[PDB]
Structure formats: C-alpha cells, structure tokens
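Subject: mismatched residue count in predicted assembly?

I count 283 residues in my input, but I want to confirm that the predicted structure covers every chain. Input:
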Amino acid sequence: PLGSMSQSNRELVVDFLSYKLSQKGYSWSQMAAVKQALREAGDEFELRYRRAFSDLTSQLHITPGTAYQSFEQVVNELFRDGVNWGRIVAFFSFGGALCVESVDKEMQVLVSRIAAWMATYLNDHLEPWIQENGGWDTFVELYGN
Amino acid sequence: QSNRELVVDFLSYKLSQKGYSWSQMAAVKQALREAGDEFELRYRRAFSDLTSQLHITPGTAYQSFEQVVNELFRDGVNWGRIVAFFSFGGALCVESVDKEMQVLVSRIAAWMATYLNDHLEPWIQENGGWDTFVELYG
Ligand SMILES: Cc1ccc(CN(C(=O)N[C@@H](CSCc2ccccc2)C(=O)O)C(=O)c2ccc(-c3ccccc3)cc2)cc1
Ligand SMILES: Cc1ccc(CN(C(=O)N[C@@H](CSCc2ccccc2)C(=O)O)C(=O)c2ccc(-c3ccccc3)cc2)cc1
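Triage response: the counts match. Full output below for your records.
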C-alpha cells in the first residue's frame, strides 16, 4: 500500500503525543479521552474481578465457526438486571479476553469477527441507554470523578 | 461518537498487553513511549534544557521548530536523539495546553511528521528501520 509509511509515521507521532498529553491529564481529542478512560477502566475491572470473570469468559467456546448469536447470548448475562457503566466496562473486557484467546489459539480470523460483534451489540443493545445517560463524555466524568 | 473506534482501540490495547500487534507499529509505539519516559526521567536535565530552547507562541511556524531540532542532530543522527526529539514534541504539546493554546497541538504534530520524513527517515531506513530500535531500546 502506497500510504503505509505515511500511516505508520502518523500513528507513531499521535500515539506518542496522546500518551504524553494523557500523563498530564490532557487529551489529544475527546475520543482519545474516552479511549484512555475505557483502557484504564478495563484494566481496573480485570484486576479486581479476574478469576470470577473467567466464569463469564469461559461461557463462550470460540471456534472458527462461532457467530454473533452465541456471543450475544453470553453478553446478555451482564445486562439481565439492567445497564450501567460498570456492566458496559465488563462487556469491553469480555470482548478483549475473547480476542486475546482467539489469537492465543491461532484463530486470528475471530479478531475481526469479535470486533464486529462488539460494535453490533453496542449499537443494538447499549447505544440507546448510553445516549439517555449522558453519552461517553459522562462515562469519562464519572470514572475520573 | 464512534463505537467502532472504541472497540478497536480497546482490543488493540488488550492485544498489546499480551505482546500481540493489532497494527504493524504496536511494538515500536510501546518501545518509543517507554524510551521517552526513560529519557525524561533518567536525563531530566537534558530534557528540560532541550524543551526550553523553543519559546512557543500562536505565531510559531515549522522553521523555528526545525532550527532547534537541527541543533539536537548537529553531531548526527542516533536512536537516543530520535527519542529526545519525540519527548521534545511531547513537552511542547503539554506546554501549549498549559498556556491555553490546545490548537498548537495539531501544529506540533504536523511539524514532527515533516521533520521525521524530511530529516530522520533516510537514516532510520539505512540503520535497520524501527525494528532495530525495538531490539536496542525495547
Ligand atoms: C472500572 C470498573 C468497572 C466495573 C466494576 C465492577 N462493577 C461495578 O462496580 N458496578 C457498579 C456499576 S457503575 C461503576 C462505574 C461507574 C462509572 C465508570 C466506571 C464504572 C454498580 O453495580 O454500582 C460491575 O458492574 C461488575 C460487572 C461485571 C462483573 C462480573 C461479571 C461476570 C463475572 C465476574 C464479574 C462484576 C462487577 C468496577 C470497576
Ligand atoms: C539545543 C539542545 C540540544 C540538546 C540538548 C540536551 N541534549 C543533549 O545535550 N544531547 C547531547 C549530549 S548528552 C549525550 C548522552 C547523554 C546520556 C547518555 C549518553 C550520552 C547529545 O545527544 O549528544 C539532549 O536532548 C539529549 C538527547 C538524547 C539523550 C539520550 C537519549 C536516550 C538515551 C540516552 C541519552 C540525552 C540528551 C539541549 C539543547
């Protein structure tokens, strides 16, 4: 691809500057602040619930044949008693754990599939609640206090 | 706004924590961030002396940034100086936000891509590319 070098150089500059801004409580953009808050929230959730969380992640047996329906059914477990930001963070951590597992088990085909499942689940089931509850900007405020 | 952007960012981060690369640059990015932290902490005096060379205003253009950065590479190019160059750009961006000039962040990012492309990329490619930096500083 003719743009690879340009994309690589831009990705490197922006990654470095976003990191340095974030260390000072600033942001490259509002999206960069949401991303960073979600990275940290996912790390915090995973550190506090690791072993208990494997009771949820272990509910989905991933193969090259796994479709959206099976992912949706397991994720619906997080939202049976309703939606909140904590449950939303765990949903991202769930997707993250499946993605890592897919790569570990040489099923790299599932990375794209999992990313697509997450966007569909968010747009079909969580986006109406997110918008009614102040959007991602509110998540950043609440998480950061 | 974009849930796709948040999904990819989160998955790329979780992959990177396990030494897996969503993009080609993941190992390079990780090594550079950490080398930047190490330079700023271990050689904070050089870092502070470098940062103070450029007085940024709403009127600062590429030419002033390039003049200071040229002095950094006066004795030639090496990986340590490249690290300092990224730390220098980072420090100018933080200072711009401190002084209520967040707009200058995009200007600095554009200066850095131009300087890298025009002055540093030929040396980087002749010296084993960014993969060689990863082996040396990561
Ligand atoms: C960063 C972080 C995220 C989530 C949590 C945990 N948290 C939880 O404080 N809730 C709160 C919901 S609001 C929490 C919040 C507000 C704003 C931003 C981020 C988090 C509650 O029930 O009151 C959950 O909602 C939660 C979600 C899933 C599990 C779980 C599911 C399956 C198996 C094992 C564990 C266990 C707990 C802790 C820390
Ligand atoms: C206009 C201006 C330019 C430069 C400076 C400060 N200044 C710097 O005098 N540089 C010189 C001398 S410091 C060399 C050195 C330091 C530590 C270990 C080994 C060598 C250089 O890069 O030649 C650096 O910015 C600098 C750059 C890179 C490093 C470094 C980076 C990574 C690892 C080790 C050293 C260390 C220092 C201030 C103002």
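The interface with chain B takes residues 4-5, 8-17, 19-21, 24, 26, 28, 31, 34-35, 38-39, 42, 92, 95-97, 99-100, 103-104, 111, 114-115, 118-119, 122-123, 127, 136 of chain A (CB under 8 Å). Marking this ticket as 'not a bug'.
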